Structure 1
Amino acid sequence: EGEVTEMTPEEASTLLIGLKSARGQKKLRLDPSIYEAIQKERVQVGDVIYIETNT
């Protein structure tokens, strides 16, 4: 759960999403299908999002 710092495509489609909280940043390689889930939510840089990376 964090503020979106980056949403960069890295595949022909796999993203890197950067997430930020008050305590640090992390980057996640996204499966093409959870990326579409994030894209159906209207997520953009600067949004705060919650992700269940297992489910």
Structure 2
Amino acid sequence: KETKEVYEGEVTELTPEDKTISHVIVGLKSAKGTKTLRLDPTIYESIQREKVSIGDV
């Protein structure tokens, strides 16, 4: 048995923190709340490979 943490919502901004791949600050926004998260550069590469933009859930 294990517990998992799940984040979802509408994207408001993509701000890279930039030798090395910098982290990215994401503006995940749901209908009942809003918060900003810092992502691992591997996750940054993965999300940029999804070709997402502002306003994409």
Q: Same fold (TM over 0.5)?
A: yes
Give % identity.
67
Instruction: Judging by fraction of residues, say which structure has more strand.
Output: 1
Number of equivalences: 48
Could you tell me which runs of 5 or more consecutive residues in structure 1 were left unpaired when the two chains were aligned: 49-55
Provide the TM-score with structure 1 as the length reference.
Answer: 0.78
TM-superposed deviation, 1:36: 0.4
Pairing 1:16–2:52 present: no
Answer 1 or 2: higher relative contact order, Cα 8 Å, separation at least 6.
1
Provide the TM-score with structure 2 as the length reference.
Answer: 0.76
RMSD (CA atoms): 1.2
Question: Highest CA radius of gyration, 1 or 2?
Answer: 2
TM-superposed deviation, 1:45: 0.8
**Runs of 4 or more above 6 Å deviation:** none
